[model samples]
Target chain A: MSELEKAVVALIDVFHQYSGREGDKHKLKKSELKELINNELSHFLEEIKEQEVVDKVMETLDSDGDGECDFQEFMAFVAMITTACHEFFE
Target chain B: MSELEKAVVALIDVFHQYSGREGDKHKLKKSELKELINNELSHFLEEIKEQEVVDKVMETLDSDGDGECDFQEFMAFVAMITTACHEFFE
Candidate 1:
């Protein structure tokens, strides 16, 4: 596979890596989100070092404010960040 | 950073690689999209061997039906495909 394909697979693998560390193993919670961003997305996201910030991230990802993050929403969330990064790069 | 961060950066770079090849230099026309899938995403996407398939892709992606595929939509497009691949793997 090429780099783009590797990227796509890596994104999927990373989501499962973080998502499986907690209760659901199929979803991510607020603290799990913090680790994912701080560890995996430090370049794209601000350092999520505060509880309030994780709440805000929950708000950002939880479109209906459900206090949860699922796989699809997580994909959408990163896609949005990637879009902004592209806009910045261009 | 981790593999995930590398993936994000790779994705952004690959989009620009193709998006710059055409008229807009920031958007993808049908042929560019085809080449992208044919070359970059053959592992995840079905081999796009037909013009009608590209038309179908444009129809799928062109929400405004404008016959264009910008980076945002492209991200969403690949996100959808990646999501499906994730489901398959999970």
Candidate 2:
């Protein structure tokens, strides 16, 4: 597979692993999302280093107006963001 | 280069290609974004049959809740989603 293809596949795998935790069937809560991101997803962000971009995503995806992104919100967020990136990069 | 590097590079290239359209830059309008997706990005999405994901992206990036995405919002949106996907998949 191409590098781009592999990267996208890796991204999907990450989403699949974290989107819905055990026993839950919706999206991830903000706290869980944060934890996953801080602990597991740090390297990805470090590579990009776009703080404004990160902040904007945090604001939009936090649909509950609770300063946190839930599972559904996160999923929606991911779907949208990835799609955009794919389009932009493709 | 590694598969991961190629994928990420491809993605970045896509973003750079679209962010500015001749002049009057800021962000892409929803219509512009939509057109780009249809005309240039269709192939990418097809490789990853996730329509819901695309819809969600449209909804979020369409900041101002105007049913479309502007350039700034699109950029922010791209930054976040790509970062997230990179994290998830990495």
Best by TM-score: 1
For model 2, state the Cα shift of residue A23 in Å: 2.7
lDDT by residue for model 1 (B38-69), tens: 99987777899888999999889877666888
lDDT of 2 by residue, A1-90 (tens): 433345456555554465556434334544445545555534343432455655665677878886656544654654564455456544
DockQ value of candidate 1: 0.79
Model 2 residue B13 distance off true place after TM-score fit, in angstroms: 4.6
Clashes of each: 0, 17
Error of 1 at B90 (Å): 5.2
> Each prediction's DockQ?
0.79, 0.12
Regions more than 4 Å wrong, model 2: A1-12, A29-31, A44-62, A65-72, A75-90, B1-13, B29-35, B44-69, B75-90
Clashing pairs in 1: none
Candidate 1 lDDT, A20-69, residue by residue in tens: 99888888888788888898877777887788888977888987566778
DockQ of 2: 0.12
